[PDB]
Amino acid sequence: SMNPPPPETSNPNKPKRQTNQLQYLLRVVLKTLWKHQFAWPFQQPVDAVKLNLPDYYKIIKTPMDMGTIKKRLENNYYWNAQECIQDFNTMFTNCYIYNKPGDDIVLMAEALEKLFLQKINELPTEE
Numbered sequence: 001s002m003n004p005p006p007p008e009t010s011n012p013n014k015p016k017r018q019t020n021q022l023q024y025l026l027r028v029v030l031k032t033l034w035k036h037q038f039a040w041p042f043q044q045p046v047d048a049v050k051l052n053l054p055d056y057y058k059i060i061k062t063p064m065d066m067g068t069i070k071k072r073l074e075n076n077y078y079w080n081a082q083e084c085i086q087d088f089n090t091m092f093t094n095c096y097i098y099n100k101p102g103d104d105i106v107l108m109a110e111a112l113e114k115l116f117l118q119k120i121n122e123l124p125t126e127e
């Protein structure tokens with residue numbers, strides 16, 4: 001298949017913690033983006049077969065998507081908020097690497113990223 005195995009959403013050897021910040025990342029940040037009208041291209045791994053993107057995984061070697069992030073949060077996979085924030089940033093960075101400025105998918109990502117950053121601005125201090 002053109003598609004690689006998707007990123008793991010569990011791993012018994014991965015170290016993990018729960019924190020108030022990770023809780024906010026699920027309850028606020030992920031939920032807000034997940035329900036947005038532009039979420040759908042980002043709700044699951046990029047499917048190069050369905051989407052006719054035979055070059056996608058020649059270019060994008062660190063794939064990430066919000067379906068994976070959602071499951072990682074639900075599974076308490078992360079050690080800290082930074083790991084989760086990094087996954088969101090990988091997703092956006094991949095979109096801007098693969099697609100051209102001004103493309104519809106880029107306009108969608110930019111709207112989601114603006115909202116992401118508005119929610120991150122209110123991330124509680126860890127306690």
Ligand SMILES: CCn1c2c(c(=O)[nH]c1=O)[C@H]1C(=C(C)N2)C(=O)OCc2ccccc2OCCCOc2ccccc21
Pocket residue numbers: 040041042046050051052095098099104105
């Ligand atoms: C986030 C991953 N992604 C992605 C896309 C893309 O172009 N670049 C990406 O990085 C595709 C895409 C997804 C899910 N995802 C998608 O549903 O296409 C549909 C499609 C399937 C079969 C043939 C041609 C098709 O559409 C032609 C228009 C150009 O495609 C667009 C346009 C707007 C939004 C998304 C996309």
